[PDB]
Design an enzyme around this catalytic site. Structure first.
Site, PDB file in Angstrom:
ATOM      1  CD  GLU A 110      -0.970  -2.336   2.334  1.00  0.00           C
ATOM      2  OE1 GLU A 110       0.114  -2.806   1.924  1.00  0.00           O
ATOM      3  OE2 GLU A 110      -1.477  -2.683   3.436  1.00  0.00           O
ATOM      4  CB  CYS A 165      -0.682  -3.105   9.015  1.00  0.00           C
ATOM      5  SG  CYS A 165       0.125  -1.592   8.452  1.00  0.00           S
ATOM      6  CB  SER A 188      19.764 -45.094   0.704  1.00  0.00           C
ATOM      7  OG  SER A 188      18.986 -44.001   0.272  1.00  0.00           O
ATOM      8  NE  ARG A 236      17.352 -30.512   1.715  1.00  0.00           N
ATOM      9  CZ  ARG A 236      18.432 -31.237   2.009  1.00  0.00           C
ATOM     10  NH1 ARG A 236      19.614 -30.655   2.190  1.00  0.00           N
ATOM     11  NH2 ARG A 236      18.322 -32.554   2.147  1.00  0.00           N
ATOM     12  CG  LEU A 269      19.775 -31.865   7.119  1.00  0.00           C
ATOM     13  CD1 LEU A 269      19.150 -31.885   8.497  1.00  0.00           C
ATOM     14  CD2 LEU A 269      18.994 -32.763   6.176  1.00  0.00           C
ATOM     15  NE  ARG A 307      23.684 -29.217  -0.488  1.00  0.00           N
ATOM     16  CZ  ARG A 307      23.172 -29.737  -1.602  1.00  0.00           C
ATOM     17  NH1 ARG A 307      23.518 -29.256  -2.791  1.00  0.00           N
ATOM     18  NH2 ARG A 307      22.301 -30.733  -1.526  1.00  0.00           N
ATOM     19  N   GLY A 363      13.163 -40.392   7.329  1.00  0.00           N
ATOM     20  CA  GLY A 363      12.740 -41.426   8.217  1.00  0.00           C
ATOM     21  C   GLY A 363      11.391 -41.992   7.852  1.00  0.00           C
ATOM     22  CB  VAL A 408      10.343 -39.159  11.070  1.00  0.00           C
ATOM     23  CG1 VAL A 408       9.870 -37.742  11.318  1.00  0.00           C
ATOM     24  CG2 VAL A 408      11.570 -39.475  11.936  1.00  0.00           C
TER      25      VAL A 408
HETATM   26 ZN    ZN Z   1       0.688  -2.267   6.134  1.00  0.00          ZN
END
Ligand code: ZN
Ligand code: ZN
Ligand code: ZN
Ligand code: ZN
Lengths: 359, 359, 359, 360
Positions: free
Chosen positions: B51, B74, B167, B183, B203, B206, B292, B295
């Protein structure tokens, strides 16, 4: 233009699909002075070949004409003269052949036979399509083994059932209907006895105009199959079983009485290479293998398949103990795992169908 | 026309993609006497708001004009008059807001402030496309939990390695790179210690100018993470570890002196909902989970994911003891398996990339 | 399924395309036990009909089978048994007819011959495609009048030559080449004498696929045709001239000697409707009207046309006195000009070809 | 490909000014620093800031060491404020990507040289084709000192404009009429012969939703036959210029000029089209949409004064010798002398086919 006619030839061949049993589909078109004077396809097993129909329809017009055939005209002398000879005698002056006979003992024989009569012979026109046309038959004749398609349905994370063996609702009706098409393009459907015990499927083709039914092949080492299974009692399709010497003689009797044909292998474990060889000897040129992660495990391991089709549903089944798509031994190093090539990706309903092939 | 301007605002907003850090993308278009006089977008973290750019550009034309904003201006009266106010002191008669501020606390304060001054505020315009624009950020605000993406690579039959743990490249180079993009769009990357000790990964994001490395989150039940591994050392990106009380106090202290933020959970096993809660406390709006089988199983069993991305290679690994995609408890009955929805299918090199979402 | 079979019969029918000339295009497919056992199409003038080829190919499988035919089987007795007869004589169980024989009298007579033999006759299967398959033949049989196509070439502003009579480069060789095709799909070519006195054309199909030159019809009211014209001396094709009593008697005699057909209308001016009636009585089923803006003007004024084809070139001639596409009277008020409908707008080379039909 | 992406954006930003810039060309600009977009701008108002000024301001200090994409060559002349090439140099921009050079061959490349002298790398040609498309009419006028001309007409399939009695009631559809009104918006003037004014007495005004500053109405006269009766005259809705000649009544010349109606006079008994266009090209006009009079269209055609031909064909046959044709008047006597055109578009609209063609 040569392709225009060869394409007509290919479309004509397609009208015989599933009426020739183990015989190849073939199309023939007789063109005289820029005019289509004859068309033919191989429509019935052990009956007239495409060239025979096309030549007859052409009548006097065959004289001086060209003819397009999707497969090299037979050249052996059986009950009736071979098509190459039929062509020679009709007066055709030019022949357009999509591809040569797959048999090494025959390939080029018809071609040379006709050239040797004056006729000009051009080859290769639309070969790829001529190839796709009889892909199963072609593979069968070139290797002496049936064309094998492996098919399975799983969750997106690769499970074919939960840890309790529940596989209800893993594939949508759309995916099952799409898979049903292979029960029409293959001469036999194969599963291990495990599938019969868990699901008691009829394994039949239930499409629209479903005339012929494929042979149902069950792999049953110890012959522990339930005697009341549909595959043994519905009489809808032939049922064949492969066991070993551990099978019970009295049980074999009872089942043969139900019309089941049993093949007793001489090994202690069923070898897929053995069963494929016995099926070819019976004239089975194709196998739709749809079940048992272990059964799929052996076909892969042995390298006995030409097409792999997996249906994935948009769902995640958890599972340390849930069964995966392929079980058994498998490959230990990523260097020894053969590379496939995705041949297709299609969305059916809410599921995704992935098809791939070797090399 | 109404939707036309808002669409422009949206296109401008997108030009800020990846340049705003944790702030949301926003577009603003000032229209006067039927002519576009100002346009703006939030291009950089901590800098001018859409804005603010649009109003400046429009200058004198700003008086008595309309303004289209993709997100509610805002309201806070911080160290500079907020945009809602800036819109006000500019003579803009009408404001078109596409959607209200996600913060249930401020949601509407802006609309009101303006309306309570003569301004005509109309909301809803292309609210749908505006939801797309800031997907991750909105989920965060709406739920107080980080937006989660699960990603894994596997063979066509769902294995993430052979029965040897090998793997050794299932997926292709091209697929890893496509995977790297995430990532970059997530504020954190998560894996279990299992992944740490087996690949000692970096991790790191890159790809091109990242201008900010994501937080590396590791799930370490007993804190058995190697103290030589890249995530511990290499000081390239923040590294947070979640553990339980089985962790050694000195190891916990040692690693803490190296800049590692250790969070201790008072439960026997790490509970995904707790890790996600703590991360949102720390300001993490999204997390890219890629490591995992176990996981991933925890995130699926808990229903803690907004997106899942699986890359399938044209390979078959097999073996019953080969690790599958999702391990862990999993669902026992198919009636309890949640129905997801395929969202995209893209071939990457010789590999296939399936992405899917909830409900 | 009947759909499939009738479609097949249509595609087979097309294969006769312009090889039967007068005879219409018909396709036949015999089905037995869900299997195609016979396929036929009318391939040459005066030769075997579609049903004949199909039935013969089917042989003994014809018994108790079904047969699909794009056009009601003939009942013409005499030189051969009517196809309606061959159908019952073969033991056909049921026949599917796409449409009835347009010949007013013959309509339904084929269905009846078969129905009174016990055969269940079903009709209307894909009557739409079967309608477009023989558009000209159908119209000629239903109305008694030849199917009429008007063709002209002009500049983008619609002039057919400059104000000095120059028309050297209006359309490209490609348009004139696309025009030639129609000289082969019509039983006759019609032009006023103006065209003969202006260009002295041969009005013959040059295309290397001819073996049956169309009738060259000249409308020459007062018989002013140049006696030495190709149309009178070249004798490469039939030349029919329509005059009135104002034709010089001896001149008609000198022309007929050359083998030209002279029709003396009984009106003092040539009436298109009369000419068409006479052409119909002589067997001509279609006429391609190429020349004379006035001749076109008459066909258009009487509403004696089924199709209009205009070739527009990317050129602008201009000229108050330059000749327009349509001459003659024309409609006085817009409320009275018939509304046509564009049927095709395809580019041919650098020109545009527009095709339209009545109502 | 990334470079093309930014120029794409620049071109799309430029279009937002399509509305009101009047004679000013449409331009866009985007600044990128270290791979991030930091400044976007477009020329939005006639007489106001150029796209570069907007983008460069928006970029602030990010401009330093940055790249900038502009769809047109940054201006280099000296006026009330420094030129954009100067602004770019002073802001610290390292390299400029210019779609195309300036039209005015008197200014062409001057901005490029300035920046190059300051060590700015100037890469030209990125998406030049599209930038060309963007200001095609402006681009033509600047490069020929002449207005871009479009001829439009509607007729039957057999090229007639009316029956032999002058009736042209339902010649073309309402859709085609609708599609034809669009063009009154992309042109600064609408040309029509007096024959038309008296024929249907048209407003020649643009009705498409949203229109500022209506297009100049130009009437080609001779004997100042234009009836003071109404519309283009006492229908104060927009400009209505009139080109007349000798036999122009002295009394009425002013009796009309008394409203706000202009009155140009030519020193020939034949209003020569090329003369008319040159005058217009002087009065700042850059485009003309000639729609009325077959003779009027004929004049433009013989003279070869047009860049676009747009004909609408209805699926009707009017026929009739003496029925008015699309283009009348002189014309070409020999086919060897007929200019070959090129069809650029075939669009179906309603029951009608609309054909557009361009010269060689
Ligand atoms: Zn604003
Ligand atoms: Zn044969
Ligand atoms: Zn017949
Ligand atoms: Zn400038």
């Amino acid at each position: 233009m040569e392709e225009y006619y060869m394409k007509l030839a290919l479309d004509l061949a397609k009208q015989g699909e599933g009426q020739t049993e183990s015989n190849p589909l073939v199309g023939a078109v007789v063109v005289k002075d820029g005019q289509i004077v004859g068309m033919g396809a191989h429509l019935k097993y052990g009956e007239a070949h495409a060239e025979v129909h096309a030549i007859h329809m052409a009548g006097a017009h065959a004289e001086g004409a060209d003819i397009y055939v999707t497969l090299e005209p037979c050249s052996h002398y059986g009950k009736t003269p071979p098509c190459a000879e039929l062509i020679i005698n009709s007066g055709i002056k030019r022949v357009f052949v999509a591809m040569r006979d797959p048999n090494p003992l025959v390939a080029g024989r018809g071609i040379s036979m006709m050239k040797e009569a004056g006729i000009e012979v051009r080859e290769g026109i639309l070969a790829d399509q001529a190839e796709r046309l009889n892909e199963k038959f072609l593979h069968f004749m070139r290797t002496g083994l049936p064309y094998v398609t492996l098919k399975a349905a799983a969750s997106l994370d690769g499970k074919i059932a939960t840890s309790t063996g529940d596989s209800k609702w893993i594939t949508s009706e759309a995916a099952r209907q799409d898979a049903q098409q292979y029960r029409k393009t293959h001469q036999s459907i194969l599963v291990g006895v495990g599938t019969v015990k868990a699901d008691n499927p009829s394994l039949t083709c239930r499409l629209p105009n479903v005339t012929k039914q494929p042979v149902r092949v069950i792999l049953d080492t110890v012959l522990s199959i339930p005697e009341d299974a549909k595959v043994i009692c519905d009489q809808i399709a032939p049922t064949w079983i492969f066991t070993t010497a551990r099978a019970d003689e009295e049980k074999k009797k009872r089942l043969s009485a139900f019309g089941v044909n049993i093949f007793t292998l001489e090994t202690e474990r069923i070898q897929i290479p053995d069963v494929l060889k016995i099926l070819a000897e019976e004239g089975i040129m194709s196998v739709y293998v749809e079940g048992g992660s272990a059964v799929h495990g052996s076909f892969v391991k042995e390298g006995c398949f030409q097409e792999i089709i997996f249906y994935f549903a948009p769902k995640l089944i958890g599972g340390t103990h849930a069964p995966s798509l392929i079980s058994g031994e498998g490959f230990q190093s990523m260097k020894d795992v053969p590379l496939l090539q995705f041949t297709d990706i299609t969305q059916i309903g809410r599921d995704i169908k992935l098809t791939a092939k070797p090399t």
